[PDB]
Design a protein around this nucleic acid. Structure first.
Ligand SMILES: [Mg+2]
Ligand SMILES: [Mg+2]
Ligand SMILES: [Mg+2]
Ligand SMILES: [Mg+2]
Ligand SMILES: [Mg+2]
Ligand SMILES: [Mg+2]
Ligand SMILES: [Mg+2]
Ligand SMILES: [Mg+2]
Ligand SMILES: [Mg+2]
Ligand SMILES: [Mg+2]
Ligand SMILES: [Mg+2]
Ligand SMILES: [Mg+2]
Ligand SMILES: [Mg+2]
Ligand SMILES: [Mg+2]
Ligand SMILES: [Mg+2]
Ligand SMILES: [Mg+2]
Ligand SMILES: [Mg+2]
Ligand SMILES: [Mg+2]
Ligand SMILES: [Mg+2]
Ligand SMILES: [Mg+2]
Ligand SMILES: [Mg+2]
Ligand SMILES: [Mg+2]
Lengths: 56, 110, 117, 120, 46
RNA sequence: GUAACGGGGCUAAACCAUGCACCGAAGCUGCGGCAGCGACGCUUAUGCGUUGUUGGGUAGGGGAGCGUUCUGUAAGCCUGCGAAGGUGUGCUGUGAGGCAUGCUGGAGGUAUCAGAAGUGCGAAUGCUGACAUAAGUAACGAUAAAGCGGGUGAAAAGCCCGCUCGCCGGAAGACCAAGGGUUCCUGUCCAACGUUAAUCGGGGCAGGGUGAGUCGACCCCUAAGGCGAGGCCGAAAGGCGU
RNA sequence: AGGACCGAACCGACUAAUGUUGAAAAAUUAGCGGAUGACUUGUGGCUGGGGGUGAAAGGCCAAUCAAACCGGGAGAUAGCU
RNA sequence: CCCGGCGAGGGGAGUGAAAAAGAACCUGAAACCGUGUACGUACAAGCAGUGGGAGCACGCUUAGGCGUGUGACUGCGUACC
RNA sequence: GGUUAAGCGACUAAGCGUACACGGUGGAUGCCCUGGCAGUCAGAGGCGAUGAAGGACGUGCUAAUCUGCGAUAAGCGUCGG
C-alpha cells in the first residue's frame, strides 16, 4: 500500500504541525546553591532541595 | 548589531534541528541557553554550541553584552547529503542519505 | 554547428512560470504543471471573456427587475414599456440608474407605464 | 490489561529480571548509592528494602534467606552487621530515589538510589 | 549457500593465467586484444 | 440513501387552447481592430480609393515568420564608464518574440543583409545528474542478558579496570589448510566507515612485527591428466600421440 | 554378513510455521529421510554449446538454459507499440 | 584573536579589485528546502483556475485615484499526452 | 448613565497558502581550453634472437604515484649546440 499521488508540502507541514517540541516551562532554583535545575531532579552540581546529595 | 554563528555541515537532518531551533527562536540568549540545556535532543547540543559561539562572537568581535542578546534569527538550512548504500534483501540496494544541515544563529540586542 | 539549447529553454519555461504565479503548489513552480495551468487559464480567460458579458447582463436585469418591482411593475413589462416609449437605454445604464438615481428610475418606470397603458 | 498488577517487566524475561535485581541489590548494599534508570531504581526499592527489613533480625535462618536472595556473603554480612542495625528503628523507607536526569547514550531517565543514612 | 566462486589460486592460474593464455592461439589473441585495449592487468596472474 | 420533476417546492409553479411580454448563444446587430480572397479606378516596388465576402478544425496540403549556434559582412561595431550568462521590472508586437533597464556577473558580445544547421521538448515504463514523496515512517540482522563501581574522556549503556550475572563448551574453545593479504602489535586520531554514541575498532595515520639444515614449499618421484622432439593425421588454424 | 536396523557427525530436503522491500536472490525454526554405501567429502583433472553431462527433470553446464556466456555480422528485422 | 573537544564549524582580523572569489572555491539557473514580512485561511466540499469581487496591506500621487500583493464571497469550470 | 434583552460582530493560526525579500541545496547556463574530432601537406611505413611489443621489479635526499631510467638505474662517456 503506497500513495497514488505525491502528497504536498502543505500536507507534510500539516502532519508536522504536531511535531513541535515543548520547551521546559521553567527551571527550578536550588534554595542553597541557587543554581537552576530540572524540577525534582538533582542539580548538576549534586544538590537537591538545598542538600548536597552526591559529591559529583 | 547582529552577530552570526554557523555550524555548517552539521551531521543531522535539518528537520530534526529545526525542532530545537523553533524551540529557541526569538528568546533571550540566557533563556535560550537554558532551553537548550534541558532539551533532550542531539540537535539541542549542536544548536547550543552554535548559540554559544554566536554569543562569544558578539561579546568578542562586536563588544556586545550577553544580557542584551536575543536569538533574532535561528534558521537551519539543508547541507549536502552524504550518499550511502544500504544492502536490502534479495540483492537490492537502497541509497540512504546522511543529511547534513547548516545551523545559523543570529543574536542581537536590537 | 551544435546548439546548446539551455538559454532559450530556460527562457520559455520562465515565461510560463511567470504566467503561473499565484497558482497552488506545482502549478506555480513546476513547468509541466505550470504549463497545463497556464493553458487552462487561457481557455478560461477566453471562455469567460464571453461569460462576463452575459453575467453582467444577468446582474443588470436582476437589479432592474428589483427596482421596477419597487415601482410596481415587473422587469418584462418594464422593458416592453420602455421599447414602446422608444427609450433606448441599455440594461447597464438602467441598472446603474436603478442603484444611483432612484427618482430618475421612477421617472423611467412612469414613462414605460404610460407607454403600456 | 494490567489492572492492579505489580512489577515491571523491564523488557526482560523473569529470570533475567531476578538476576539483575539480585546484582543491583548487591551493588546498592555495598556502595550505598548507585546510578541506574529511574524505573529500575523504583523496582530496586521493592527488592532491597525487604532485604534490609529481613536483616533487622540476625538469625541463621535470616542470613540463609538473605544469602538465597543475594547470593553474596559480603552483601549478607553488610546487611546484618551494618544495615540492619543502622535501620533498626526506621519503619521502612531505607532507600531514596533522586532523579538525576537523562543518560546520554539512550536518553534514558536516570536516578540515584541510595541508602537513606548514607551521609552518616 | 555455496556460491559459484570458490577461489583456488592454482586453478585460477591454470585456467586463466599468463601461461595458459600463451599456450594457445586463441589465448594469445586474448592477450593481444587486452594489450591493444591497454589493460593494466593482462591476466589473473598476481 | 430520498433516488422514476435536477432540487426546493408546486393544486399550479400541472395539462390543453389562445395571446401578448420578457429571458436566453461565441447565431444576428451595434462599435472598434486584424487578416485572407475577390471585383472595381488610379498603378507598379502597390498604395490604396474603395468595395463585397471570408476567417471552427484533426489527419493533411499550402503560405509567412520568430528564435538558437556557427560563417561572411567584422582588424567594423558594443564592451571594465561593465560583455555573455543569471535574476527582476517596465515597455512593445498578431504570435514565436523584441527592446530598455535595476541587481548579479566579471570578459566577452555582435547589428545589418546573406550563408550553414547537432535549430526549438513534456511526455518516448526516454537517457544522465540533482532533488522530492511515502517519513523522521519501517528498520538498526538471531529473545545468549545484563547490573553496578571505578577510570579515561568535551561527552561513556557500548571503551578500559573490577565485581557480579548470563551464554557456548564435539564450540560459540584451540591449531591449520584453502582463501584473504597487514586485517597482526604499539602509538595516535574520530571527519567518513561501524546500521546508535564512541574515548573504542578489522576505520584513518604513523611506527613496529614474520628469524628454520629438521615445519612447509622448493626439491627427488610418480597418478589422473597436460604438453609433447621426431611422427601420424588434418583446407589453414590445428588433432592425436612416441 | 548386510545397497540390514536405531541413531549423532556428515549427506539430504517430506511437513508446517515464519520470512517474502528477508538475517537469506531458497534461509530459519520445529519436526523429517539416508547415515558401511548405487555412501559422503577434500584436492587436482577431463568432457564445451546443437555441444557436454544427465539413476531422465529438458535436469545441470558460474544466482543465466527447449540451446550458456562474451564479442562480432548489428543500427538484424519489427506491415507492431 | 575569539567560541569550540589542543575538534568540526564558525566569528573577527588581514590578503585581494572581489572572500556573498576561502580551497565543499568563476558564473551559480531549476526542482527541492527554509527564515522573515504582507494578505488569506479552523462551518467548509471536487483539475484549484477563470470572470466578478469586498476587505486588508504596501508604493506612488497633491487631492483626485492609479501600481502591487493578497484575496472573503460568487458565476462558470472533470488535468495533459 | 446603569442593568437586562435581542441582533450583529472584529481580534485566534496549530498549521497551511499565495506574493515578495533573503538564504540553503544543487550544479544548469554563460564564458574557458595543455582534450578530442575531421582533414591537408609532408615524412615514415615497421619493431624483433645485437632479445621486440608489452610488462614485473627496482631506481632519488624520497613515503607514494606518475615521468624517466635499469644495479652505471630522474642517469654514464663523447661530440656538438
Ligand atoms: Mg546477497
Ligand atoms: Mg525495548
Ligand atoms: Mg451574447
Ligand atoms: Mg482556420
Ligand atoms: Mg557566444
Ligand atoms: Mg508532445
Ligand atoms: Mg505511515
Ligand atoms: Mg519499530
Ligand atoms: Mg545487533
Ligand atoms: Mg559504568
Ligand atoms: Mg589497513
Ligand atoms: Mg587489533
Ligand atoms: Mg557513528
Ligand atoms: Mg586499524
Ligand atoms: Mg639458527
Ligand atoms: Mg611437431
Ligand atoms: Mg542401512
Ligand atoms: Mg539432491
Ligand atoms: Mg531442520
Ligand atoms: Mg530406514
Ligand atoms: Mg537456437
Ligand atoms: Mg534495432
Amino acid at each position: 500500500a503506497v500513495q497514488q499521488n505525491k502528497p504536498t508540502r502543505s500536507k507534510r507541514g500539516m502532519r508536522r504541525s504536531h511535531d513541535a517540541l515543548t520547551a521546559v516551562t521553567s527551571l527550578s532554583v536550588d534554595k542553597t546553591s541557587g543554581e537552576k535545575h530540572l524540577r525534582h531532579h538533582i542539580t548538576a552540581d549534586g544538590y537537591y532541595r538545598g542538600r548536597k546529595v552526591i559529591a559529583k | 548589531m547582529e552577530t552570526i554563528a554557523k555550524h555548517r555541515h552539521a551531521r543531522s537532518s535539518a528537520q530534526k534541528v529545526r525542532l530545537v531551533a523553533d524551540l529557541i527562536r526569538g528568546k533571550k540568549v540566557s533563556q535560550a541557553l537554558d532551553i537548550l540545556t534541558y532539551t533532550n535532543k542531539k540537535a539541542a547540543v549542536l544548536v547550543k554550541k552554535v548559540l554559544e559561539s554566536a554569543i562569544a562572537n558578539a561579546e568578542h568581535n562586536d563588544g556586545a553584552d550577553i544580557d542584551d542578546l536575543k536569538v533574532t534569527k535561528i534558521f537551519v538550512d539543508e547541507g549536502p547529503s552524504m550518499k550511502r548504500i544500504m544492502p536490502r534483501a534479495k540483492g537490492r540496494a537502497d541509497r540512504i542519505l546522511k543529511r547534513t544541515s547548516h545551523i545559523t544563529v543570529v543574536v542581537s540586542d536590537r | 554547428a551544435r546548439v546548446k539549447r539551455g538559454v532559450i529553454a530556460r527562457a520559455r519555461h520562465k515565461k510560463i512560470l511567470k504566467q503561473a504565479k499565484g497558482y497552488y503548489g506545482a502549478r506555480s513552480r513546476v513547468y509541466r504543471v505550470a504549463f497545463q495551468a497556464v493553458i487552462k487559464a487561457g481557455q478560461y480567460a477566453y471562455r469567460d471573456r464571453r461569460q462576463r458579458k452575459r453575467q453582467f447582463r444577468q446582474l443588470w436585469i436582476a437589479r432592474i427587475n428589483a427596482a421596477a418591482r419597487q415601482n410596481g411593475i415587473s422587469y418584462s413589462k418594464f422593458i416592453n414599456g420602455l421599447k414602446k416609449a422608444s427609450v433606448e437605454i441599455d440594461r447597464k445604464i438602467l441598472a446603474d440608474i436603478a442603484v444611483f438615481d432612484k427618482v430618475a428610475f421612477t421617472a423611467l418606470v412612469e414613462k414605460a407605464k404610460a407607454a403600456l397603458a | 490489561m494490567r489492572h492492579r498488577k505489580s512489577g515491571r517487566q523491564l523488557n526482560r524475561n523473569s529470570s533475567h529480571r531476578q538476576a539483575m535485581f539480585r546484582n543491583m541489590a548487591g551493588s546498592l548494599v555495598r556502595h550505598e548509592i548507585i546510578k541506574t534508570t529511574l524505573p529500575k531504581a523504583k523496582e530496586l526499592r521493592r527488592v532491597v528494602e525487604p532485604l534490609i527489613t529481613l536483616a533487622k533480625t540476625d538469625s541463621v535462618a535470616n542470613r540463609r534467606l538473605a544469602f538465597a536472595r543475594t547470593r553474596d556473603n559480603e552483601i549478607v554480612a553488610k546487611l546484618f552487621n551494618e544495615l540492619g542495625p543502622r535501620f533498626a528503628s526506621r519503619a521502612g523507607g531505607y532507600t531514596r530515589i533522586l532523579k538525576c536526569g537523562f543518560r546520554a547514550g539512550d536518553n534514558a531517565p536516570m536516578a540515584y538510589i541510595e541508602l537513606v543514612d548514607r551521609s552518616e | 549457500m555455496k556460491r559459484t566462486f570458490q577461489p583456488s589460486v592454482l586453478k585460477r592460474n591454470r585456467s586463466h593465467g599468463f601461461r595458459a593464455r600463451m599456450a594457445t592461439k586463441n589465448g594469445r589473441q586474448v592477450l593481444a586484444r587486452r594489450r591493444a585495449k591497454g589493460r593494466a592487468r593482462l591476466t589473473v596472474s598476481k
